Design an enzyme around this catalytic site. Structure first.
Site, PDB file in Angstrom:
ATOM      1  N   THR A 140      38.407  11.706  33.799  1.00  0.00           N
ATOM      2  CA  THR A 140      37.397  10.691  33.462  1.00  0.00           C
ATOM      3  C   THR A 140      36.877  10.844  32.004  1.00  0.00           C
ATOM      4  O   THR A 140      36.715   9.879  31.285  1.00  0.00           O
ATOM      5  CB  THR A 140      36.324  10.729  34.531  1.00  0.00           C
ATOM      6  OG1 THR A 140      36.872  10.042  35.656  1.00  0.00           O
ATOM      7  CG2 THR A 140      35.057  10.091  34.100  1.00  0.00           C
ATOM      8  N   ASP A 198      49.440  16.233  32.861  1.00  0.00           N
ATOM      9  CA  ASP A 198      49.205  16.477  34.275  1.00  0.00           C
ATOM     10  C   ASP A 198      50.325  15.748  35.083  1.00  0.00           C
ATOM     11  O   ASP A 198      50.537  14.515  34.951  1.00  0.00           O
ATOM     12  CB  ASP A 198      47.843  15.971  34.699  1.00  0.00           C
ATOM     13  CG  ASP A 198      47.307  16.692  35.902  1.00  0.00           C
ATOM     14  OD1 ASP A 198      48.009  16.783  36.937  1.00  0.00           O
ATOM     15  OD2 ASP A 198      46.158  17.162  35.782  1.00  0.00           O
ATOM     16  N   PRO A 221      25.824  12.416  33.714  1.00  0.00           N
ATOM     17  CA  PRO A 221      25.289  12.268  35.095  1.00  0.00           C
ATOM     18  C   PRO A 221      26.390  12.234  36.131  1.00  0.00           C
ATOM     19  O   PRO A 221      27.488  11.694  35.843  1.00  0.00           O
ATOM     20  CB  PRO A 221      24.630  10.906  35.054  1.00  0.00           C
ATOM     21  CG  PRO A 221      25.447  10.119  34.074  1.00  0.00           C
ATOM     22  CD  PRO A 221      25.866  11.117  32.999  1.00  0.00           C
ATOM     23  N   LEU A 222      26.102  12.770  37.306  1.00  0.00           N
ATOM     24  CA  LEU A 222      26.929  12.588  38.487  1.00  0.00           C
ATOM     25  C   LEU A 222      26.936  11.128  38.889  1.00  0.00           C
ATOM     26  O   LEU A 222      25.850  10.493  38.840  1.00  0.00           O
ATOM     27  CB  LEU A 222      26.410  13.425  39.622  1.00  0.00           C
ATOM     28  CG  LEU A 222      26.980  13.105  41.013  1.00  0.00           C
ATOM     29  CD1 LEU A 222      28.240  13.862  41.327  1.00  0.00           C
ATOM     30  CD2 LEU A 222      25.892  13.496  41.960  1.00  0.00           C
ATOM     31  N   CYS A 223      28.100  10.566  39.170  1.00  0.00           N
ATOM     32  CA  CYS A 223      28.136   9.213  39.744  1.00  0.00           C
ATOM     33  C   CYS A 223      28.733   9.267  41.124  1.00  0.00           C
ATOM     34  O   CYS A 223      29.824   9.825  41.256  1.00  0.00           O
ATOM     35  CB  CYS A 223      28.895   8.261  38.793  1.00  0.00           C
ATOM     36  SG  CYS A 223      28.770   6.505  39.220  1.00  0.00           S
ATOM     37  N   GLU A 225      33.520   7.781  42.564  1.00  0.00           N
ATOM     38  CA  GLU A 225      34.359   8.200  41.427  1.00  0.00           C
ATOM     39  C   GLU A 225      34.836   6.963  40.665  1.00  0.00           C
ATOM     40  O   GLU A 225      35.084   5.963  41.256  1.00  0.00           O
ATOM     41  CB  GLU A 225      35.556   9.032  41.847  1.00  0.00           C
ATOM     42  CG  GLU A 225      35.520  10.419  41.233  1.00  0.00           C
ATOM     43  CD  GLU A 225      36.898  11.044  41.154  1.00  0.00           C
ATOM     44  OE1 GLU A 225      37.650  10.936  42.168  1.00  0.00           O
ATOM     45  OE2 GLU A 225      37.208  11.634  40.077  1.00  0.00           O
ATOM     46  N   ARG A 232      36.672   4.240  38.418  1.00  0.00           N
ATOM     47  CA  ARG A 232      38.052   3.801  38.220  1.00  0.00           C
ATOM     48  C   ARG A 232      38.108   2.380  37.667  1.00  0.00           C
ATOM     49  O   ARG A 232      37.230   1.578  37.931  1.00  0.00           O
ATOM     50  CB  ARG A 232      38.732   3.847  39.581  1.00  0.00           C
ATOM     51  CG  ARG A 232      38.799   5.242  40.172  1.00  0.00           C
ATOM     52  CD  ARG A 232      40.193   5.765  40.027  1.00  0.00           C
ATOM     53  NE  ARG A 232      40.399   7.038  40.716  1.00  0.00           N
ATOM     54  CZ  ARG A 232      40.540   7.171  42.026  1.00  0.00           C
ATOM     55  NH1 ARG A 232      40.473   6.125  42.841  1.00  0.00           N
ATOM     56  NH2 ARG A 232      40.713   8.384  42.513  1.00  0.00           N
TER      57      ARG A 232
END
Ligand code: ZN
Lengths: 51, 283, 304, 320
Positions: C31, C55, C265-267, C270, C272
Site C-alpha cells: 500500500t 514480490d 492511520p489504520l484503515c 484494506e 484497493r
C-alpha cells in the site's frame, strides 16, 4: 684564570686524541626513531618546581 | 549531503547551549554508524562533534568524544598517517590544559599511535603537539619525555623549557647549570640522536655564555669544538662525553672517566648505560 | 531545517531516479509503495514513473485491481504511472537451467531486473524518469552493494580464467553503486508498524542500508489507531492497543529524530483500486491529523 | 487428536522443569504465571516454584507483591512460590575463554541459578517438585546444552597436540597441565548431567509463547528450531491476544474486526505448521491481568480451551 691549567691540559689532549680519526658515528647521525627500542635511564627529579 | 545537515542541526543545538541534547543526538547518530560498521562516517561525525564541544568549552563532552574517536580508530584499524594524526592535532589544540583528564586523553592518543605505527613510543609529530599541551598544564616531566621522542621542532621546544627553567632558578651555581644541561646530553645520547644532542648543546651553551658571561675558550680540533669553561668542569665532561660516545672507543671512555672521578660517581647509572649502548659493557 | 513528519520533499523531488521501499511482515508495504508512486505521479505530471514489484505474490495487481506482469502497463486512470511485476529468482533459474562469495547471486539478479526495465523503455519509446522499487520482503536483495569492495580485496590476493569476469562484474556493480549511494539519486523508505518486533527489524534494516552506504531517512509507520481522537470511544480494546502503539512511537521519535517519520492511520477495509489508494496516499504528503481527517478514513471504511 | 490446551502438561507428575519463552510482548509473563497457577491448583500435593530471570521484576508486577532472591509463597496459595533473580549480577558477585568458547557464560550462569534454588530449598524453604522457568526474553540462555559436544571436540584436539611432544617439553610447559583440562572436563561433566534431564521429554519441556502476527510467527519458528538443535522437547505453543471479534461487537468495533481477520489468517498458518503441537489459543483481555484472582480466572483457559461463545462473560468481567 689559568689556575685551571691541569684540566685544560687534559681536555686539549683528549680532544686531539679522539678527533685523530673520524669518530665512528658522525655528528649528524640519528638512529631512526622507528628502531629505538629503549630509553636508557631515568634522570633524577629536580628540586625546583616549574611554573 | 545528509551528513552536513545533521552536523548543522547539531551545531545549532550547541550555539543554543543545549549541550545535553546535542550530545544525545550525536550519540544516537554516531552509534548507528558504528553499529552498521560505517566507520568513516562515524569518524567524521564523532571528531567534528568533539571539536565543537571543545570550542564551546565543554571539556567533559569533548574529551568523552575523543575517547569514542579512539575506540573507532582502533575498531576501523586506522593506521598512523598525516590525516589520522591531524584530526588529533586539531583536537589537542582545543583542549584546556587544565582538563582533569588531559593525561588520559593524551595517553589514549599516543597508545593508538603506538599500536598502528612502527614506533615503540608513538608518532613523533603527534608527540610534538602533546608535549606542548602537557607543558601548558605544568606537566613538565611528561612534556620532557614527549619532546625527547618528538621532531626537530620538539628539540627546540625542549631546549626552551629547560632554558626557561634554569632562568627561573633563583640561586644559580656551578652544579646547577649541569643539572639542566646534562639532561639534553644524556637523553639524546640515550636515543642515539647525535645531531639533536649536538644542536641542543650548541643552542644551550650559547645562551648560557650570552647571559652569564662565564670565563671560557673554544678549543677546536678537526672540525669539533669543546667549550672549555674555567668554572664548569661538569660542562666539559658532558661535552667530551658526547664525542667519546661517537667514537665507540672503550679506551677514550675509560680515559675520560679516570680524569673526572667525581663525575663518574655522579653519573654512575647514566654512564653504565652509555657504556652498554656505545661501548659493549654488558654484565 | 526541522524534519517534517511526511514525505513531501521526496514526493516533489526532481532528482531521485531510484526510490526503494522495504519492510518485513504485514506492515502495509505494498500500500505504501503504491501510495508513494501515486503521490509522485500526481505531483509531477510532466514526469513518467514506474512502480515495480519483485514480490512473487503479484501484490500490485491485487492492490490496483488490474493484471500487471513483466511488460510495463500504465495504471488505468493515470497518464504517468506504470506498473511491473517480475520474479528475478525465476528469471535467473530459467537462464541458468539453459546450460562462496557474498553478493554475487544478488548482483546478477539485480542486473537482470535493470536489463528488463531498460528493454521495456526501449520498446515503448517511453523512458521512465523515476523508478519506485517495491522490494521483496525476504532476502538481502541489495547485498551486492558490498561486492566491489569484497572482490577488490579478492583480486589482490589473486581451464577458464575468471579474473576478467570478476573485474567486469566489479565494474558493473560499481557503476550501480555510484548512483545507489548518491543521496540525491537514490533513497530507501522503510515501512513498519508500532510494535516491538517491527521496530527491532526496522533498526536492523536501517543498519543494513547504512552499511551499504544507501541513503535512508524515511520511515512510514502504518496501522496507527489514534484511538483517543476518533470518537465512538467505544472500544477500549483499541484504546489499550493505542496506548502500546504510543509507547513505541515515543521510542521511534527518540531513535529517529533526524528522519522523516510519517505516521499513517489504520484503515478498516484494506485499500484497493486507484481511487481509494490516492485518497489514502495524500497523508504521505501532508500528515494525517486525526481530529480533522478522520472522516476521510471513515469514508473509505464506509464505502467498503 | 492433539488437544488445543495444556491439560496433559498441567496434570503431568513427571516434569521437573518447565521452560516458558517468547520474544516481543506476547503475554509471556502472564503465561508463565498462568501455567504455574494451573499446575499448583491441579496438584495440591506438590510444591511449585515460578522463577523469573527478567530484571524488570515482572512477577512482582504481575502478582502485586514483592518477590526477590528468596523464595516466597504467593499470598493466597499454599502451593506456589516465586523467585526473581539476575544471573549476570549473581555471576559478577561471584576469562578470555568465556568469550572464546560458546555456551560457557550461559553454563556458569545457569549453574548459579540452580545453586540458588537448591540452597533455597535447603534453608527450610521446602523442596520444589517442579520449577516453572520464566526465561529472559533476550539471549540464548540454553546454548550451554551444546557445550559438552563443543568441548569434547576441543579436548580431542588438545589430546592430539599435547601428546605429540616430549616429555622434556611437555613437563616444562605443564605446570597445572592436567589442571586446566581437569576444569574443562568437570565443566563438560556438569553440563552433560544437566542435559540428561533437559533432553528427557518426561522431565523437561519448553512452552513457546506467541501472538498471531507475521514477525512473531517467524520468531517462533526460529525459537523452535533453536530448541530442537539443543534436543530440548517442544510441542506446546500458547497464542495470546486473540480478539475473537465476531463474538462481541459490543466490545468489538470494525477496527477490531479487521484485526481479527488478520489474526485468523496466521492462526490458519499455525494450525497447518504445528498440527502435532498443543496449540493453545488464548483470548485478549483489554486490561492487563494482575493479582492472583484475575490470573487464576484467566489461566483456566490453558487447561480447558476458551470458547468465545460460552466463556466471553468471564473475559468481559475482567475487563471492567
Ligand atoms: Zn476496537
Amino acid at each position: 684564570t689559568s689556575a685551571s691549567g691541569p684540566e685544560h691540559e687534559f681536555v686539549s689532549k683528549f680532544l686531539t686524541l679522539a678527533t685523530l680519526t673520524e669518530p665512528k658515528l658522525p655528528k649528524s647521525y640519528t638512529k631512526p626513531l622507528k628502531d629505538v627500542t629503549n630509553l636508557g635511564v631515568p634522570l633524577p627529579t629536580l628540586k625546583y618546581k616549574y611554573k | 549531503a545528509k551528513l552536513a545537515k545533521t552536523l548543522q542541526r547539531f551545531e545549532n543545538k550547541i550555539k543554543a547551549g543545549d549541550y545535553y541534547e546535542a550530545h544525545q543526538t550525536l550519540r544516537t547518530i554516531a552509534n548507528r554508524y558504528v553499529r552498521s560498521k560505517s566507520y568513516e562516517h562515524a569518524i567524521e561525525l564523532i571528531s567534528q562533534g568533539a571539536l565543537s564541544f571543545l570550542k564551546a568549552k565543554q571539556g567533559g563532552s569533548g574529551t568523552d568524544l575523543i575517547f569514542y574517536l579512539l575506540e573507532v580508530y582502533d575498531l576501523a584499524e586506522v593506521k598512523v598517517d598525516d590525516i589520522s594524526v591531524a584530526r588529533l592535532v586539531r583536537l589537542i589544540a582545543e583542549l584546556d590544559p587544565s582538563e582533569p583528564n588531559l593525561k588520559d586523553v593524551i595517553t589514549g592518543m599516543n597508545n593508538w599511535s603506538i599500536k598502528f605505527s612502527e614506533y615503540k613510543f608513538g608518532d613523533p609529530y603527534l608527540h610534538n603537539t602533546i608535549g606542548s599541551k602537557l607543558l601548558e598544564g605544568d606537566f613538565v616531566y611528561e612534556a620532557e619525555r614527549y619532546f625527547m621522542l618528538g621532531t626537530h621542532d620538539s628539540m627546540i621546544k625542549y631546549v626552551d623549557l629547560l632554558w626557561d627553567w634554569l632562568c627561573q632558578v633563583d640561586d644559580i651555581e656551578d652544579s646547577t647549570v649541569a643539572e639542566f644541561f646534562s639532561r639534553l646530553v644524556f637523553n639524546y645520547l640515550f636515543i642515539s640522536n647525535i645531531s639533536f644532542a649536538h644542536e641542543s648543546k650548541d643552542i644551550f651553551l650559547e645562551r648560557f655564555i650570552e647571559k652569564f658571561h662565564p670565563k671560557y675558550e673554544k678549543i677546536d680540533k678537526n672540525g669539533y669544538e669543546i667549550v672549555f669553561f674555567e668554572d664548569y668542569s661538569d660542562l666539559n665532561f658532558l661535552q667530551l662525553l658526547l664525542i667519546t660516545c661517537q667514537t665507540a672507543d672503550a679506551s677514550y671512555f675509560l680515559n675520560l672517566k679516570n680524569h673526572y672521578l667525581d663525575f663518574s660517581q655522579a653519573y654512575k647509572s647514566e654512564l653504565e648505560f652509555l657504556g652498554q649502548e656505545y661501548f659493549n659493557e654488558n654484565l | 531545517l526541522t524534519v517534517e513528519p511526511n514525505l513531501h520533499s521526496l514526493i516533489t523531488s526532481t532528482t531521485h531516479k531510484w526510490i526503494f521501499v522495504g519492510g518485513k511482515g504485514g506492515v502495509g508495504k505494498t500500500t505504501s509503495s503504491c501510495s508513494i508512486a501515486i503521490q509522485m505521479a500526481l505531483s509531477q505530471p510532466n514526469k513518467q514513473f514506474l512502480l515495480i514489484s519483485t514480490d512473487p505474490a503479484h501484490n500490485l495487481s491485487d492492490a490496483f485491481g488490474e493484471k500487471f506482469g513483466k511488460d510495463a502497463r500504465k495504471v488505468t486512470g493515470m497518464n504517468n504511472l506504470s506498473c511491473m511485476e517480475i520474479d528475478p529468482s525465476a528469471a535467473l533459474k530459467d537462464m541458468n537451467d539453459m546450460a562462496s562469495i557474498p553478493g554475487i547471486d544478488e548482483a546478477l539478479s539485480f542486473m537482470e531486473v535493470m536489463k528488463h526495465i531498460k528493454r521495456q523503455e526501449q520498446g515503448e519509446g517511453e523512458t521512465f524518469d523515476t523508478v519506485i522499487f517495491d522490494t521483496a520482503p525476504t532476502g538481502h536483495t541489495l547485498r551486492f552493494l558490498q561486492l566491489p569492495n569484497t572482490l577488490s580485496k579478492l583480486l589482490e590476493k589473486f581451464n577458464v580464467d575468471i579474473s576478467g569476469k570478476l573485474n567486469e562484474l566489479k565494474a558493473n556493480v560499481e557503476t550501480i553503486r555510484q548512483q545507489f549511494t548518491d543521496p540525491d539519486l537514490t533513497t530507501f523508505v522503510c515501512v513498519c508498524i508500532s510494535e516491538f518486533l517491527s521496530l527491532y527489524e526496522t533498526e536492523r534494516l536501517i543498519q543494513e542500508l547504512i552499511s551499504y552506504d544507501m541513503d535512508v531517512n524515511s520511515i512510514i509507520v502504518n496501522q496507527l489507531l489514534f484511538a483517543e481522537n476518533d470518537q465512538e470511544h467505544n472500544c477500549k480494546r483499541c484504546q489499550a492497543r493505542w496506548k502500546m502503539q504510543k509507547k513505541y512511537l515515543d521510542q521511534i521519535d527518540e531513535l529517529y529524530e533526524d528522519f522523516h517519520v510519517v505516521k499513517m492511520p489504520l484503515c478498516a477495509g484494506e485499500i484497493r483500486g486507484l481511487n481509494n489508494l490516492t485518497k489514502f496516499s495524500q497523508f504521505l504528503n501532508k500528515e494525517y491529523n486525526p481530529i480533522t481527517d478522520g472522516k476521510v478514513i471513515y469514508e473509505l471504511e464506509d464505502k467498503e
